C-alpha cells in the first residue's frame, strides 16, 4: 500500500512543507499511505515530502518500545539538546545512509493519524528520527551538510 515516493534529487524533497491548519481525511489517506509505505521501505520513518505530500506530516516507525508505529501530522520542534550523529538513509537516496549530526534529544508537537495534536518529548533514536522528518518535510536534508 505504497503511495508515490520522490527521490532525490527532487524538489518536493527539498520543499517546505506546510502543517496544516486541521486534518482532513485527505490528509488522512496521506499519513495512512506513508506508513504502508515506509514500512514497505523498511524504513524507520517516512516524511510527508518524501512520499509526495507537499504537506508537513511525519510518519516514524522507530522500535521506541514493542511494536513500531508512530505518527504526527504537521510536528513543530519545541526543544533540542546534545549533539549527536549516526548513519542513515532517505527514502528519497537510493539507501546511501550517511553520519547525520542532529540534537540528542528534542520535544516535539504533533498530532496523531488520529488527528488529535499532542505534544511529545522525543530523546535517542525518536528525538532523531522525529527532528529528521521535521527537516525533511521541510525541504531541508541531511545531505545539506554532507561533504
Ligand atoms: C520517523 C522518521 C524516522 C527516520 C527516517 C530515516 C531517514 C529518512 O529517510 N527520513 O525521512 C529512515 O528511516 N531511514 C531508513 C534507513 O536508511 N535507516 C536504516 C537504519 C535506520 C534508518 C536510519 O539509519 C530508510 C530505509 C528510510
Ligand atoms: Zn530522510
Given at each position: 500500500?505504497?503511495?508515490?515516493v520522490?527521490?532525490?534529487?527532487?524538489?518536493?524533497?527539498?520543499k517546505?512543507?506546510?502543517?496544516?491548519?486541521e486534518?482532513?481525511?485527505?490528509?488522512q489517506?496521506?499519513?495512512?499511505?506513508?506508513?504502508?509505505?515506509?514500512?514497505a521501505?523498511?524504513?524507520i520513518?517516512?516524511?510527508?515530502?518524501?512520499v509526495?505530500?507537499?504537506?508537513?506530516?511525519?510518519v516514524?516507525?522507530?522500535?521506541?518500545?514493542?511494536?513500531?508505529?508512530?505518527?504526527?501530522?504537521?510536528?513543530?520542534?519545541?526543544?533540542?539538546?546534545?549533539?549527536?550523529?549516526?548513519?542513515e538513509?532517505?527514502?528519497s537516496?537510493?539507501?546511501?545512509?550517511?553520519?547525520?549530526?542532529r540534537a540528542?534529544k528534542?520535544?516535539?508537537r504533533a498530532?496523531?493519524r488520529?488527528?488529535?495534536?499532542?505534544?511529545?518529548?522525543?530523546?535517542?533514536?525518536?528525538?532523531?528520527?522525529?527532528?529528521?522528518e521535521?527537516?525533511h518535510?521541510?525541504?531541508?536534508?541531511?545531505?545539506?551538510?554532507?561533504?
Amino acid at each position: 500500500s505504497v503511495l508515490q515516493v520522490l527521490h532525490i534529487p527532487d524538489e518536493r524533497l527539498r520543499k517546505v512543507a506546510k502543517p496544516v491548519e486541521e486534518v482532513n481525511a485527505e490528509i488522512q489517506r496521506i499519513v495512512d499511505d506513508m506508513f504502508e509505505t515506509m514500512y514497505a521501505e523498511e524504513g524507520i520513518g517516512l516524511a510527508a515530502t518524501q512520499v509526495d505530500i507537499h504537506q508537513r506530516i511525519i510518519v516514524i516507525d522507530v522500535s521506541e518500545n514493542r511494536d513500531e508505529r508512530l505518527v504526527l501530522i504537521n510536528p513543530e520542534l519545541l526543544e533540542k539538546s546534545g549533539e549527536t550523529g549516526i548513519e542513515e538513509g532517505c527514502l528519497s537516496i537510493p539507501e546511501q545512509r550517511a553520519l547525520v549530526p542532529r540534537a540528542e534529544k528534542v520535544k516535539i508537537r504533533a498530532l496523531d493519524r488520529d488527528g488529535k495534536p499532542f505534544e511529545l518529548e522525543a530523546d535517542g533514536l525518536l528525538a532523531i528520527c522525529i527532528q529528521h522528518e521535521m527537516d525533511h518535510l521541510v525541504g531541508k536534508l541531511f545531505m545539506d551538510y554532507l561533504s
